[PDB]
Design a protein around this ligand. Structure first.
Ligand SMILES: [Mg+2]
Lengths: 1212, 134
DNA sequence: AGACAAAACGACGCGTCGTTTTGTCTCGGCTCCCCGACATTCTC
C-alpha cells in the first residue's frame, strides 16, 4: 500500500525533484524531500538557443583554436623561409645576426625585434636599399608627384622591377617574406567550373521599363532594358528606384543547348559585399594586364594617398600571387648563380627534411622555384580524414586480445551507400517491396505479372540499365499505362535504381573503341574504389590514366569521359560490407541465386531449419514463420527480415530491457557517458545533472537499495527532446522483471501535461500558497514606488493579490520569478497518479457511468480534487518555505592537458614517425583571461592622475557620438582644437558635423579650422581613459598591451578579519589565482597585507547566511534547526568588484521589474542586485554574513563529531 | 642582488669548536646578516637541548641575542604547508627540510646554505642550495 | 621662562561610501562526420 514516488520537473537549466511516500487508499502520505537544482547561465543563452546563434562555448574554443593554429602555421612558413634563405646566404648580416639557427631553428633571439631593412648603428636606424629607393624617387619624379615618400614603399618598386630586371638577393628575400605574409584566397577542391564562368561584375544603366502586360497583384509588371542590349531576368514594381539608376550587377552566362547565352542576374553592392569587392579588384588587376605588385605600384604612383592594405587590394585569387612569385623567381634565376647551384639545393633539402629521405628523393628532382612556391609558401594541407568517425555496423563485430590480456572488440565501419554492393542490396529490397495495384478496382493485381522467378529476373535486368525510374517506365516495363494501374508507391516520386552502375555504363559508352563487355563486376567494383578513394585532381587523373594503361583502353577519350565525374555524396548505409556481402545470397532468386555462395554457418542453419531438428540458436517463431521453407530451394527470394535472421540468428533488434540493481550501475552509466552524444549541450547538461541528482537522492534516502523508487513521474512544462530520452534512461530503475512491464519505457513512468498541473495548482490552493509566499516582494515594490498598483485587494478571498501595472506587464508571469516553482511542479507531478493523468487526458467517456467511478474516487461532489491527506496544503507550505536552492559552480581556472605531436624517433636502428607526448608540466587555463580590446599607456601633462591608476589610449572612429565632453577626451590637443573649431562652426551639432559627409567636408577644408595651417586628414582618433588596466604579458611587446578583466572572471572575493574584529575585503583577479593554483597553493591568500586572518572566500553562486542585527554569530554552527526566519536570510553572491560584493536572495530567479535609466526604478536598484539586504534594516551583507555549504539536494553541510573522527580515520 | 637564507647546519658549525674551519666559514656567513626561518631557530633550540645539553636560560639568552643582532628572522608564511606539499611530489627530501625550503622560497629567498640537501640543486627553478664550506 | 607635546591653519587634495552609467572584436569561403524530427514502402 505504501509507495515511494519521485516527481521530476525538467527545465532549460532547472531540475525540480520531489520524493514522497504515499497511501492514496488510506488517504495518507507525507513529503520526504523536495529541492531544485539550478545551472547558471545568462538569459542571453536562453533567448539565443530558441533561434540559434553559435550557442556553444565549445564552438568559441574551436574558433580561437583555429585562429591560433593559422597563426603558428604562418610562423612555421616564415621559419622555414629563414632557414632556407640563411643557407642560401641571402639574409643580410645585421638581420641574420639576430636569428637563432642552432637551438631554436630560425627563431629570433629572445627580446629582439629585427627588421630586414632598418639597420641599427649606434642607436640610429638607416635604410639598407638606397639605390632602389633613389630609382623609385626618379620614377615618381618622371610621374611628377612629390619627392618625399616613405622608404618602405620600395617593396612595390622592387616587385615591379623583379619582373624584368636584376635585383640584389636581399630584396628577393624581402619579397619572398612579403609573399609569405600575403598568400591569397584559394579553394582546396578547385574543380574549375563552366569554362565561361562569366561571374562578371558590371555596372549597368536602366534605360526604359515597358509595361509587360503581366498584371500581378493589381499591378502590371515592368521589364528592364540596359544600354548594352540586355533585359533584366526579373520584373520590377518600384519605378522610382529603377529609372536611369546606375546599378551594378553580378551576372552569369551559360551557353544553352540551343546555342545561346543563358544569362542570369544578381543585384550586388560594392564596398559592402565580399564577392563584389573581390570580383571588381580582380577585374581591375586583369584589365591592367600586369602583376598585382605592379598594379599596386602604379595605383600608388597615380594616387600617392591610396590605402593599399585593406582598401585597394583586400582579397584576390591565390593564382595572382603564384604567377607573380613564379615570374619573379624565374627572371631572377638566370642572373643569380646561387639559384642553380645544386649543391646548395641539396643542402636546403637536407636541412628541411633530414629525417625524411623519401621526401628528399622526391625534391631532389625539382629546383629552387618548386621548393619555394609549391613546398614552403603555397603549401596548403588537405582536410583531416573523417573516416575514423564513420558509424559502425550493428551486426558484424570482431574480437581480439590485446597486450593487457583482455578480449575487446574492434568494429566494422559501415558501407558507403555509393558502393555497388549496397546499390544491389537496395534494389533487391525494393524489388521485394514492390507490388502493383489497378486504378479501376484498387485491387491487389500482384501475383499475376510477377509470380515466377523469370519475371523478377527480367525486372532486375531492366532496373540495372537505368539509374532512377518513375511511374511511367515501371508501368511500361510491364506494358501497363497510367490510365489503369498504380504501383503502391508515391505516384509522382522517383526511387533510386543503381545510379552508380548506370552512370558508369554511360561514361564507358561514350569512350567507344572498346568491346561491349569490358563492364563486369570486377571492373565496376575496381573503378568504383578508385573513383571513391582518390578525391584529388592531379592524383585522380594519374589514377585514371594508369587504369587506362593497365586495362587495354585508349587514354584519349576515357579520361575525358571520367575527368568531370561529380564526386559521390557523403552517406553511408546501416550495415558494413561484410554483413551486406553475407546477406546478398539469400535475397537472390533465379540465376543470380545459388546455394554455393552461402557461407558455412548460414548453410548449417538452413540445414537445421529444413531438417526440423532442435537447436538453441533457433526459436519457435522461426519455424512458425519458416514453415514454408521446407526445401533448401525455398531459400530463394527471401526478404531482408528472414535472411537477416537466418544469417545472424536474432529477430532484428529486440533490445536488452535492462535492470539496474544499485546506485553503482547508475554511477557507472554516468561515468561512461560520452560528451556531445545528444542534440545540444543544454539538454545534455540537464540530463547529466538529473542523473546525478537522482543518484544522490537514492543514496541519501534509500541507501542505494533495490527498487527503492516505487514510481517515477516525469514532466517538462524544442525542449521535448528530453521528454523521451530521460524516461528511457530512468526506466531501468523502476522497471519490473516479471514480464508484465515490457516496452520502451517502464509502465511506472507516467508523464503528465500542463493541463493536469495547472488544474491541480488551482484546485489545491497551491496558487494560494504561492501568492502568499510571493506577496512580500510586491509589498516591497509598492513601498519603493510609493503606490498601491503592485497589490490588488479582492473580496472573494478578502486579501491582497500580487499584481503588476499594465505598463510593466510586457512579459510577466508570477511563476517564473522564483526558483522553487520547480519544486512546486515536482510535488504536484508526484502526487498525480496514473488515474489522474488518464482521467484528465481521456475525459471523453462516451458514457457518464463508466468514468463516474473515477469521479467519485477523485472529485469532490466534479468540483475539486480530494486531498491525498488532510494535511497536504499546510505541509506543502512548510516544505516550500524551507527549501535551499543549490547552484552549480564553475570555478575551473587551471586543469591538465596532454599534448601529442608527430616526431621521428630512433627505434631498432630506424627513424620512424611516431607520436610523442610532451615532457614537463603544462596547464590549460579554463577561463578567458581578459578582454579582446587592447589599449596603450599614455602620459598626459594636462590630466591629473590619481595614484594607483593609469591612462590608456585606444583608437576610435570619429563619428556622430563625439560631443564636447567626448571631444575633450582625445589625447591629441591639435585634434581637439580643430574638432572644437568645426563643432562650433556647425552650431555645436556633432550629428551634422560628424556625419560621413561632414567628416569629408572637414577633411577637404582642414585649413579653415587649423587656423589656416596644413594638417593631415582625420578619420580615427586616440581617446584616453583613466583606470586600472594590466599588461597582457612580459615578453617582447606584450608588456605594452593593456587590457581589462574579461566577463565573469572575478571569481573569488576574499574576506579577512583583523585581531580586533573589523572585516576587510578584497577582489582577487584571475592572474594571481592562476599562479597560486600553479604553485599548488590555495586560490586566495590566507592573510592580507595587513596580516588579517582570512575568514573565507566567496564565489558566484555561493551561499551565505546573514544573521539578524541582534544575533551574535561567532561560533554558532547548529545549522540543523533552520526555520523560516533563518532561511529567509540566505543570500547568493552574484558578482564582485573592488571591495564590493553584490547579493540576491537565493529564492529570487527574475526581478518583477528590471531597472531602466529613464524611470530610475527597479526591484534591486540599478545593478539589479544589492550590496545590502532587501529588508528594512538595509545592513551591509559583507560585514556580518557567514559562508555556508550545501550539497546537490540543498542540505547544509557542517562539521560534526563523526566528521571530525573520519578526517583522520581515513588517514589511519 | 639575492636573498640569502641559512639552515641549522650553519649555526651548529658556528657554535662548535672542533671544526675550526667550519666554524670560521660559518661565522663569516653570519656577517652578511643572512635571513633565517622560525623553524631553523626551533631546531637550533632542540639540538642545543639534546646534543649539547645546555640549560634553558642560556639557550634563550643566546637565541634572543642572535635574533636581535646577527640573523634576521623571517615571518612564518601561511602557505608553508600547501607549498611544502607541492615540493613533496617532485622532490626527495626529509619533510623538515621540505618545510625549511618551503618557507625560504615563500619569503623570496634565492640562495640557501647547508652541507646536506643535494648541493647545487635548484628547487622549482626559483631557489638554489649552495654548500659554502667547500 | 624653557622647551616639548600637540592642537590649529592651509588650500589643497587626495581618497571614499552608494549609486548610475558606460562599454564590451568583425566578417568570408568552403569540407565532412554524427545526431535529431517529419513524410513513403517493406518485415515482424
Ligand atoms: Mg634538515
Amino acid at each position: 500500500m505504501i509507495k515511494n514516488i519521485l516527481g521530476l520537473a525538467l527545465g532549460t537549466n532547472s531540475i525540480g525533484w520531489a520524493l514522497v511516500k504515499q497511501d492514496f487508499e488510506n488517504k495518507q502520505g507525507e513529503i520526504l524531500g523536495m529541492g531544485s537544482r539550478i545551472i547558471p547561465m545568462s538569459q542571453d543563452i536562453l533567448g539565443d538557443f530558441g533561434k540559434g546563434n553559435s550557442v556553444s562555448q565549445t564552438a568559441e574554443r574551436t574558433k580561437y583554436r583555429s585562429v591560433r593554429r593559422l597563426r603558428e602555421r604562418f610562423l612555421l612558413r616564415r621559419e622555414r623561409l629563414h632557414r632556407v634563405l640563411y643557407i642560401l646566404n641571402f639574409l643580410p648580416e645585421h638581420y641574420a645576426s639576430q636569428i637563432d639557427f642552432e637551438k631554436r631553428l630560425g627563431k629570433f633571439k629572445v627580446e629582439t625585434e629585427p627588421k630586414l631593412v632598418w639597420k641599427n648603428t649606434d642607436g640610429q636606424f638607416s635604410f639598407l636599399f638606397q639605390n632602389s629607393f633613389n630609382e623609385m624617387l626618379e620614377d615618381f619624379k618622371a610621374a611628377g608627384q612629390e619627392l618625399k615618400i616613405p622608404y618602405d614603399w620600395t617593396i612595390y618598386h622592387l616587385r615591379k622591377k623583379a619582373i624584368s630586371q636584376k635585383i640584389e638577393k636581399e630584396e628577393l628575400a624581402w619579397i619572398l617574406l612579403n609573399f609569405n605574409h600575403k598568400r591569397g584566397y584559394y579553394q582546396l577542391r578547385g574543380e574549375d567550373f563552366e569554362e565561361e564562368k562569366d561571374k562578371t561584375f558590371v555596372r549597368l544603366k536602366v534605360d526604359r521599363i515597358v509595361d509587360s502586360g503581366e498584371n500581378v497583384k493589381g499591378k502590371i509588371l515592368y521589364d528592364v532594358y540596359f544600354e548594352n542590349g540586355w533585359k533584366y531576368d526579373k520584373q520590377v514594381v518600384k519605378t522610382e528606384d529603377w529609372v536611369d539608376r546606375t546599378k551594378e550587377f553580378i551576372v552569369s552566362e551559360s551557353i544553352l543547348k540551343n546555342g545561346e547565352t543563358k544569362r542570369t542576374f544578381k543585384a550586388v553592392d560594392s564596398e559592402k559585399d565580399w564577392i563584389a569587392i573581390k570580383t571588381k579588384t580582380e577585374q581591375e588587376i586583369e584589365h591592367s594586364h600586369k602583376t598585382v605588385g605592379t598594379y599596386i605600384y602604379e595605383t600608388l604612383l597615380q594616387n600617392p594617398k591610396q590605402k593599399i592594405k585593406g582598401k585597394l587590394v583586400r582579397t584576390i585569387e591565390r593564382k595572382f600571387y603564384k604567377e607573380e612569385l613564379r615570374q619573379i623567381l624565374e627572371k631572377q634565376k638566370e642572373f643569380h648563380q646561387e639559384l642553380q647551384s645544386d649543391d646548395l639545393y641539396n643542402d636546403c633539402i637536407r636541412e628541411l627534411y633530414r629525417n625524411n629521405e623519401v621526401h628528399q628523393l622526391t625534391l631532389r628532382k625539382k629546383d629552387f622555384v618548386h621548393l619555394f612556391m609549391e613546398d614552403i609558401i603555397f603549401y596548403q594541407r588537405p582536410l583531416r580524414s573523417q573516416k575514423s568517425s564513420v558509424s559502425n555496423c550493428t551486426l558484424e563485430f570482431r574480437k581480439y586480445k590485446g597486450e593487457n590480456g583482455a578480449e575487446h572488440t574492434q568494429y566494422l565501419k559501415a558501407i558507403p551507400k555509393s558502393n555497388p554492393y549496397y546499390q544491389e542490396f537496395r534494389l533487391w529490397q525494393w524489388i521485394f517491396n514492390l507490388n502493383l495495384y489497378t486504378k479501376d478496382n484498387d485491387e491487389n493485381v500482384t501475383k499475376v505479372f510477377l509470380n515466377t522467378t523469370q519475371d523478377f529476373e527480367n525486372l532486375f535486368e531492366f532496373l540495372n540499365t537505368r539509374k532512377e525510374v518513375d511511374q511511367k517506365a515501371l508501368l511500361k516495363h510491364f506494358k501497363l499505362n497510367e490510365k489503369t494501374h498504380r504501383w503502391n508507391f508515391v505516384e509522382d516520386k522517383k526511387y533510386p535504381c543503381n545510379e552508380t552502375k548506370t552512370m558508369i555504363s554511360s561514361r564507358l559508352d561514350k569512350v567507344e573503341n572498346i568491346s561491349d563487355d569490358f563492364l563486369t563486376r570486377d571492373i565496376e567494383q575496381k573503378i568504383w574504389h578508385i573513383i571513391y578513394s582518390v578525391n584529388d585532381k592531379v592524383e585522380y587523373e594519374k589514377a585514371l590514366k594508369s587504369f587506362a594503361r593497365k586495362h587495354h583502353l585508349d587514354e584519349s577519350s576515357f579520361f575525358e569521359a571520367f575527368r568531370k565525374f561529380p564526386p559521390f555524396k557523403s552517406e553511408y548505409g546501416s550495415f558494413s560490407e561484410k554483413a551486406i556481402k553475407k546477406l546478398l545470397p539469400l535475397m537472390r532468386l533465379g540465376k543470380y541465386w545459388n546455394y554455393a555462395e552461402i557461407d558455412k554457418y548460414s548453410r548449417e542453419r538452413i540445414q537445421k531449419i529444413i531438417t526440423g531438428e532442435y537447436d538453441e540458436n533457433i526459436k519457435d517463431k522461426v519455424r512458425e514463420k519458416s514453415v514454408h521453407l521446407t526445401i533448401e530451394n525455398d531459400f530463394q527470394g527471401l526478404q531482408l527480415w528472414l535472411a537477416q535472421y537466418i544469417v545472424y540468428g536474432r529477430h532484428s533488434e529486440a533490445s536488452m530491457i535492462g535492470k539496474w540493481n544499485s546506485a553503482n550501475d547508475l554511477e557507472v552509466f554516468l561515468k561512461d557517458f560520452k560528451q556531445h552524444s545528444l542534440r545540444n549541450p543544454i539538454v545534455e547538461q540537464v540530463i547529466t545533472e538529473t542523473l546525478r541528482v537522482v543518484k544522490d537522492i537514492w543514496l541519501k534516502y534509500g541507501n542505494g537499495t533495490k527498487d527503492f523508487f516505487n514510481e517515477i513521474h516525469i514532466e517538462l512544462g524544442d525542449t521535448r527532446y528530453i521528454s523521451k530520452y530521460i524516461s528511457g534512461i530512468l526506466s531501468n530503475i523502476v522497471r519490473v522483471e516479471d514480464g508484465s512491464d515490457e516496452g520502451v519505457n517502464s509502465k511506472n513512468i507516467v508523464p503528465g501535461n500542463g493541463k493536469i498541473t495547472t488544474q491541480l495548482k488551482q484546485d489545491w490552493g497551491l496558487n494560494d500558497v504561492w501568492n502568499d509566499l510571493i506577496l512580500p516582494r510586491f509589498e516591497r515594490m509598492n513601498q519603493l514606488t510609493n503606490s498601491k498598483d503592485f497589490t490588488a485587494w479582492n473580496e472573494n478571498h478578502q486579501k491582497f493579490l500580487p499584481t503588476v501595472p499594465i505598463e510593466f506587464s510586457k512579459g510577466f508571469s508570477k511563476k517564473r520569478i522564483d526558483h522553487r516553482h520547480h519544486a512546486l511542479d515536482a510535488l504536484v507531478i508526484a502526487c498525480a497518479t496514473t488515474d489522474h493523468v488518464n482521467l484528465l487526458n481521456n475525459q471523453s467517456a462516451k458514457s457518464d457511468t463508466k468514468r463516474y467511478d473515477l469521479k467519485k474516487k477523485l472529485m469532490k461532489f466534479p468540483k475539486q480534487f480530494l486531498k491525498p491527506w488532510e494535511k497536504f496544503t499546510v505541509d506543502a507550505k512548510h516544505n516550500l518555505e524551507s527549501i535551499i536552492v543549490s547552484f552549480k559552480q564553475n570555478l575551473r581556472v587551471i586543469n591538465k592537458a596532454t599534448n601529442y605531436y608527430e616526431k621521428y624517433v630512433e627505434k631498432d636502428g630506424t627513424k620512424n614517425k611516431e607520436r610523442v607526448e610532451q615532457a614537463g608540466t603544462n596547464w590549460a587555463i579554463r577561463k578567458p583571461m581578459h578582454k579582446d580590446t587592447v589599449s596603450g599607456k599614455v602620459d598626459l601633462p594636462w590630466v591629473k592622475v590619481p595614484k594607483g591608476k593609469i591612462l590608456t589610449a585606444t583608437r576610435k572612429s570619429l563619428d556622430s557620438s563625439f560631443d564636447l565632453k567626448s571631444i575633450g577626451s582625445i589625447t591629441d590637443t591639435g585634434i581637439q582644437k580643430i574638432l572644437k573649431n568645426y563643432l562650433a562652426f556647425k552650431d555645436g551639432n556633432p550629428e551634422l558635423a560628424f556625419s560621413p559627409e561632414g567628416i569629408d567636408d572637414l577633411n577637404k577644408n582642414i585649413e579653415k579650422y587649423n587656423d589656416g595651417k596644413p594638417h593631415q586628414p582625420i578619420n580615427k582618433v586616440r581617446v584616453f581613459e583613466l583606470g586600472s588596466k594590466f599588461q597582457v604579458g612580459q615578453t617582447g611587446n606584450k608588456k605594452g598591451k593593456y587590457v581589462e578583466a574579461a566577463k565573469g572572471t572575478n571569481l573569488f572575493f576574499a574576506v579577512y578579519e583583523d585581531e580586533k574584529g573589523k572585516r576587510s575585503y578584497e577582489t582577487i583577479p584571475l592572474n594571481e589565482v592562476i599562479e597560486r593554483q600553479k604553485q599548488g597553493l590555495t586560490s586566495v591568500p590566507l592573510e592580507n597585507e595587513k596580516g588579517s586572518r582570512l575568514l573565507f572566500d566567496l564565489s558566484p553562486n555561493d551561499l551565505v547566511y546573514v544573521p539578524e542585527i541582534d544575533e551574535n554569530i561567532d561560533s554558532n554552527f547548529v545549522f540543523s534547526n533552520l526555520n523560516k526566519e533563518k532561511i529567509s536570510r540566505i543570500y547568493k553572491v552574484e558578482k564582485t568588484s573592488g571591495t564590493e560584493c553584490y547579493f540576491v536572495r537565493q529564492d529570487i530567479a527574475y526581478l518583477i521589474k528590471q531597472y531602466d535609466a529613464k524611470t530610475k526604478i527597479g526591484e534591486l536598484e540599478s545593478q539589479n542586485k544589492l550590496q545590502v539586504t532587501m529588508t528594512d534594516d538595509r545592513i551591509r551583507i559583507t560585514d556580518t554574513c557567514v559562508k555556508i555549504n550545501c550539497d546537490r539536494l540543498g542540505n547544509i553541510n557542517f562539521i560534526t563529531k563523526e566528521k571530525i573522527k573520519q578526517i583522520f580515520n581515513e588517514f589511519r | 642582488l639575492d636573498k640569502i637564507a641559512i639552515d641549522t647546519n650553519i649555526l651548529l658549525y658556528a657554535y662548535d669548536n672542533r671544526d675550526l674551519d667550519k666554524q670560521d666559514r660559518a661565522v663569516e656567513i653570519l656577517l652578511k646578516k643572512p635571513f633565517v626561518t622560525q623553524l631553523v631557530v626551533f631546531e637550533f633550540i632542540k639540538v642545543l637541548e639534546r646534543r649539547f645539553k645546555m640549560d634553558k636560560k642560556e639557550i634563550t639568552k643566546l637565541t634572543i641575542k642572535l635574533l636581535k643582532e646577527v640573523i634576521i628572522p623571517l615571518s612564518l608564511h601561511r602557505d608553508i604547508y600547501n607549498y611544502s606539499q607541492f615540493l613533496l611530489q617532485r622532490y626527495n627530501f626529509g619533510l623538515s627540510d621540505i618545510l625549511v625550503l618551503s618557507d625560504s622560497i615563500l619569503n623570496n629567498c634565492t640562495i640557501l646554505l647547508s652541507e646536506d640537501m643535494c648541493n647545487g640543486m635548484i628547487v622549482d627553478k626559483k631557489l638554489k642550495i649552495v654548500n659554502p664550506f667547500l
